[PDB]
Structure 1
């Protein structure tokens, strides 16, 4: 149908905007601490601590399959990256500190993304 196509164009455009959001958030992680999944070879107990692992590569795979229906779903995954790290790692670690800085800097980007998503519809 024509409606299904219009819906698909909306999703494609959301995906374009989320791709730009993702790039901007990932620039706030210049150390690449959050770039890839935590390695279960190197952290064998990780899934005993963290039930829903997340990282920027995993988000990118979902994004490119157009697997984010709305901004809330994308933000959920971004918050998992931060929140998982802040639980697994202690406050005095470069990992925790990196997550705090990513959260703080990412807030700004996400605030305007939400306005753009609502604005463009």
Structure 2
């Protein structure tokens, strides 16, 4: 069907728009602490602490496989990154300080991105 075609083209263009948003968010991690999944070799107990790990490259696999049906699903994954960090790592750490920084700065990118999803449909 063609009504299936227009659902796709509208997804394809969410997927376009999220790509931009992720690039902006991942510029807020200049140190690349969030670039990649926490290594299980390096931190073998990690999953005893964090049940749903998340990182930018894992979000990016799922984005290029059109796997975010809306913005909320993308926003949930981003918050996973931040929240996991701020539980696993103590307050007086480079790691926790960087999640606090990404959360504050990424809140601006997301607050505009929410309007452009609603506007553009």
User: Under a length normalisation based on structure 1, what TM-score does the superposition of the two structures give?
Assistant: 1.00
- Mind listing any 5+ residue stretches in structure 2 that lack a counterpart? none
| Cα displacement string for residues 9-35 of structure 1 (whole angstroms, at most 9, x for unaligned residues) | 000000000000000000000000000
Q: Distance in 2 between the 1:63 and 1:74 partners? A: 9
Report how far residue 45 of structure 1 moved.
Answer: 0.4
1:70 is displaced (CA, Å) by 0.2
DSSP-derived class of the 2:58 partner: helix
Query: How many aligned positions are there?
Result: 121
Per-residue CA deviation, residues 54-74 of structure 1 (Å, 9 max, x unaligned), is: 000000000000000000000
TM-score normalised by L of structure 2? 1.00
Q: Distance in 2 between matches of 1:47 and 1:34?
A: 17
Q: Equivalents in 1 of 2:3, 2:108: separation in Å? A: 34
- Quote how far apart the aligned CAs of 1:2 are: 1.1
1:23 partner SS: helix
3-state SS of paired residue (1:26): helix
| Structure 1 unmatched runs, 5+ | none
Aligned to 2:86: 86
Q: Deviations over 1:80-108 (max 9, x none)?
A: 00000000000000000000000000000
How many angstroms apart in 1 are the aligned matches of 2:74 and 2:68?
6
Q: Are positions 1:50 and 2:50 aligned together?
A: yes
